[PDB]
RNA sequence: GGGGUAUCGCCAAGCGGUAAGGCACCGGAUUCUGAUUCCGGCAUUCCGAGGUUCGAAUCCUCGUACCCCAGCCA
């Protein structure tokens, strides 16, 4: 339970409400991100918990920043997380004629006027954070005059910025938001829903409260920056004929260590091609997380974990990463692949190669078993062999034995070096009556596989607070490798996390994999210690 | 000037009766993944100073710190 639910409980009990109706309202100007997921889980979660409704409403009030691509991707991610909205998808643009009708009521009551101060001037008259503002010389036009000027606006008679509609509140109010907040501005831009029907568009504050009222939203939940704004919310609803008055409650937004959430910024990474696109696996976007191999259930857990408070905060990746590991550890069928490979032959081995039965899950027999080809000329990961080591090192030293995964206890004997002091191959003896551990892959039966080792995108924890977040990108956010994996991975499906034993949970990258050359994104590493 | 917030390294319960939980972390026991699983340890102390009370993280003063607002963006 959190503060928002205690409020809802009181509301139900006191008989203030009988049903709860929330909404998630993203603007379609970018893909959704892990931050949005916190709001989604909150809004849609309360609905199903209290057997209530939650609308998906696209706040599409600014046509020059939104695109249809986003509305489709947004609907996509919402479902993927496992949530369904109430009834049909809604749009603020759905209320354009209603909004305009309400602007007129405001005008008719003298609570709004068409101002003509330029954009620079409007800023000047607004005062500062310590100095009150001042009434525009156009502030006292007659209702009749305002009706005329507004229709001129509506009818495209004014250039952009040459006139706008404003609420007539208080230029000296300590709330900067109540100093005659603009209600309509001219934009001769094709809207993705209403095409060119409109050339004057409503501002967020005017649109949002009226839309919540019309939809019968019982609790408008959004982030902390809107606490001041709440005053305008109520002011609008108090001066127009509407029969309900939704209440807004604010909770703090999610900040994740090492990542930027600002869609402006995420947009820069994409536009400047510093990442593949919105769903690149290093992005904090829901679709990127998906491609990265996270699971809708792991994200819901994350939300469940971070809580909901008024407290500003920054979660460490350790918490996110914890969630996906827990999920995958339980449901991921284990398999084997070698990322950095150095050849290892067993001379002692006689035969064209046998077959070893390995479990799909070392702790869950229920998940079945499989037939993995063993051999003499195998593949091993470089860092597993040590020509020289100490008691700690529990892998393959040039003097002792090491158990192969689910196979034979081999024994290191004779190395062979590459001219440049490197190791070309390892020769070891095997003990036919054997069946630390190390993973392997029969050279003869090995499947060529690309591996994409992903790390955090930024090299500082709050790249946001940097003078130039771009200059603080991690150059090792993605490190590609060519390795080998057992042939069963021949049947991996896009997004189906496997646990490459002793490395990390990996998943087939849709975007890149092909027939011969599959591509595996490393979702998250294993607890290395 | 206004609106907000202050509990462990990072989250977070608490709502006058004596500091939950989770992530990280340190042990130790199993383990053919240095994984998983188990065991145990991690706030006499709740931004600071005063005060009320039998008892205060919780009430009341008085400070201090941080966040948000001056888009015809949301
Ligand atoms: N980081 C966040 N943490 C929690 N909730 C968020 C976060 N960012 C946005 N939201 C919520 O998502 C809802 C939709 O956000 P919307 O896409 O309209 O704008 P925004 O993401 O705040 O701004 P921007 O488009 O500049 O990123 C908002 O009502 C807000 O409460």
Determination method here?
X-ray
Give Cα separations from A309 to A57, A107, A221, A259 (angstroms): 24, 39, 12, 21
- Who's near A353: CB < 8 A, 6+ residues apart? A373, A374, A375, A376, A442, A444, A445
A26 alpha carbon to ligand 1 midpoint, in Å?
7
Q: What 3-state class would DSSP assign to A419?
A: coil
Active-site hit among A75, A231, A253, A405: A253
Residue given tokens 């310590």 in the structure block: A130
Å between CA of A311 and C1' of B10: 13
Query: Measured in whole angstroms, how far is the alpha carbon of residue A302 from the centre of its chain?
Result: 12
The torsion defined by the Cα of A308, A310, A313 and A318, in degrees rounded to 10, comes to -10
Q: Which residue has the tokens 């892990």?
A: A34
List own/partner pairs for A116-119 with CB under 8 A and 24 or more apart. A116/A162, A116/A163, A118/A161, A118/A162, A119/A161
In chain B, which nucleotides are within 7 Å of a protein Cβ? 1-7, 9-15, 21-26, 32-37, 66-74
Q: Which of A23, A25, A36, A320 has most ligand 1 atoms within 8 Å of CB, for mutation?
A: A36
Indicate the fold that domain A93-201 takes in CATH: 3.90.800
A54 forms bridges with which residues in the sheet?
Answer: A22
Q: Which residues belong to CATH 2.40.240.10 in chain A?
A: 332-339+447-528, 340-446
Tokens standing for residue A451:
């591996």
Both tokens of A395, joined, read 């892998």
- The DSSP annotation for A431-490 comes to -SS---EE----GGGPEEEEEEEE--SBSSS-GGGSTTGGGGB-TTSEEEEEEEE-GGGG
Instruction: Give, for ligand 1, the residue of A28, A39, A46, A207 to mutate: max count of ligand atoms closer than 8 Å to Cβ.
Output: A39
**Ligand 1 binding pocket, CB closer than 6 Å:** A 25-27, 29-30, 35-36, 38-39, 59, 222-223, 253-254, 261-264
Q: Which neighbouring-strand residues pair with A377?
A: A345
Tell me whether residue A90 is one of the annotated catalytic residues: no
Cβ-contact A308, A2 below 8 angstroms: yes
* CATH 3.90.800.10 domain extents, chain A: 93-201
Distance CA A44, CA A1 (A): 15
Q: Which residue is nearest to nucleotide B9 (CA to C1')?
A: A316
Residue A216 DSSP symbol: T
- Residue A29 to residues A26, A263, A375, A471, Cα–Cα distance (Å): 8, 8, 55, 25
Do strands A519-525 and A164-167 pair parallel, antiparallel, or not at all (unpaired)?
unpaired
Active site residue A263: yes
Rounded CA-CA distance A317/A497 in Å is 19
Q: Looking up tokens 């042939």, which residue turns up?
A: A487
Resolution of the model in angstroms: 3.0
Sign of CA dihedral A309, A313, A317, A322: negative
Q: Report how far residue A242's alpha carbon sits from residue A240's, in angstroms, rounded to the nearest whole number.
A: 6
Structure tokens at A22: 């929330």
CB atoms within 10 A of CB A373: 17
Kindly state the tokens that stand for A466.
């940097």
Ligand 1 center to A212 CA (angstroms): 17
Q: What is the distance in angstroms measured between the alpha-carbon CA of A257 and the sugar C1' of B48?
A: 29
Residues 6+ apart with CB under 8 A from A514: none
Residue A484 has a CB neighbour count (10 Å cut-off) of 25
Alpha-helical regions (H) of A89-193: 96-108, 119-125, 143-154
CA A182–ligand 1 middle distance (angstroms): 22
| CA atoms of A42 and A64, how far apart (whole Å) | 29
Q: Which two tokens stand for residue A131?
A: 């100095």
Q: What is the CATH number of domain A340-446?
A: 2.40.240.10
Residues of chain A with CATH 3.40.50.620: 20-92+203-252
Residue A436, annotated as binding a ligand: no
d(CA A19, CA A40): 19
User: Does A411 qualify as catalytic in the annotation?
Assistant: no
Write the CATH number of the domain with boundaries A332-339+447-528. 2.40.240.10
CATH code of the domain made up of A20-92+203-252:
3.40.50.620
Q: Which CATH number fits domain A253-331: 1.10.3720.10, 3.40.50.450, 1.10.1160.10, 1.25.40.10?
A: 1.10.1160.10
Strands (E), A196-340: 200-202, 219-223, 247-251, 334-335, 337-338
Closest nucleotide to the alpha carbon of A202, via C1': B72
- Count other Cβ atoms within 10 Å, centred on residue A303: 20
């Amino acid at each position: 339970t959190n503060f928002i639910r205690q409020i809802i409980d009181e509301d139900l009990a006191s008989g203030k409400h009988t049903t709860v109706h929330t909404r998630f309202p993203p603007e379609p100007n970018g893909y959704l991100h892990i931050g949005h997921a916190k709001s989604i889980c909150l809004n849609f979660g309360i609905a199903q918990d209290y057997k209530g409704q939650c609308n998906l409403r696209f706040d599409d009030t600014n046509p020059v920043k939104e695109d249809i691509e986003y509305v489709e991707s947004i609907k996509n991610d919402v479902e993927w997380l496992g949530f369904h909205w109430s009834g049909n998808v809604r749009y603020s643009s759905d209320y354009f004629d209603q909004l305009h009708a309400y602007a007129i009521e405001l005008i008719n009551k003298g609570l709004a006027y068409v101002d003509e101060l330029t954009p620079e001037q409007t800023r000047e008259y607004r005062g500062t954070l310590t100095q009150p503002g001042k009434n525009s010389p156009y502030r006292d036009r007659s209702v009749e005059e305002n009706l005329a000027l507004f229709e001129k606006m509506r009818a495209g008679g004014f250039e952009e910025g040459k006139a706008c509609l404003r609420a007539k509140i208080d230029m000296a109010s300590p709330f900067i938001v109540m100093r005659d907040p603009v209600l309509y501005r001219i934009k001769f831009a094709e809207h993705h829903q209403t095409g060119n029907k409109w050339c004057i568009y409503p501002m967020y504050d005017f649109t949002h409260c009226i839309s919540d009222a019309l939809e019968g939203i019982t609790h408008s939940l959004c982030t902390l920056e809107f606490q001041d704004n709440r005053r305008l919310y109520d002011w609008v609803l108090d001066n127009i004929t509407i029969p309900v008055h939704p209440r807004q409650y604010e909770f703090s937004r999610l900040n994740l260590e090492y990542t930027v959430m600002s869609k402006r910024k995420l947009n820069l990474l994409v536009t400047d091609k510093h990442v593949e696109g919105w769903d690149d696996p290093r992005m904090p976007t829901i679709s990127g997380l998906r491609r990265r191999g996270y699971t809708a259930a792991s994200i819901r857990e994350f939300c469940k974990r971070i809580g909901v408070t008024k407290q500003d905060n920054t979660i460490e990746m350790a918490s996110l990463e914890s969630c996906i590991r827990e999920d995958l550890n339980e449901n991921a069928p284990r398999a084997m692949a070698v990322i950095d490979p150095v050849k290892l032959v067993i001379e002692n081995y006689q035969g064209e190669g046998e077959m070893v039965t390995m479990p799909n899950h070392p702790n869950k027999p229920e998940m079945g078993s499989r037939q993995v080809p063993f051999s003499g000329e195998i593949w091993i990961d470089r860092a597993d062999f040590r020509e020289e080591a100490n008691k700690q090192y529990k892998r393959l030293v040039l003097g002792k034995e090491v158990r192969l995964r689910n196979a034979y206890v081999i024994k290191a004997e004779r190395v062979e070096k590459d001219a440049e002091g490197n190791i070309t191959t390892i020769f070891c003896t095997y003990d036919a009556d054997t069946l630390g551990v190390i993973h392997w892959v029969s050279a003869a039966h090995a499947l060529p596989v690309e591996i994409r080792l992903y790390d955090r995108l930024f090299s500082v924890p709050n790249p946001g607070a940097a003078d130039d977040f771009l200059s603080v990108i991690n150059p090792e956010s993605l490190v590609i490798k060519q390795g080998f994996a057992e042939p069963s991975l021949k049947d991996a499906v896009a997004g189906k996390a496997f646990q490459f034993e002793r490395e990390g949970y990996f998943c087939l990258d849709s975007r890149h994999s092909t027939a011969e050359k599959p591509v595996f994104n490393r979702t998250v590493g294993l607890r290395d210690t």
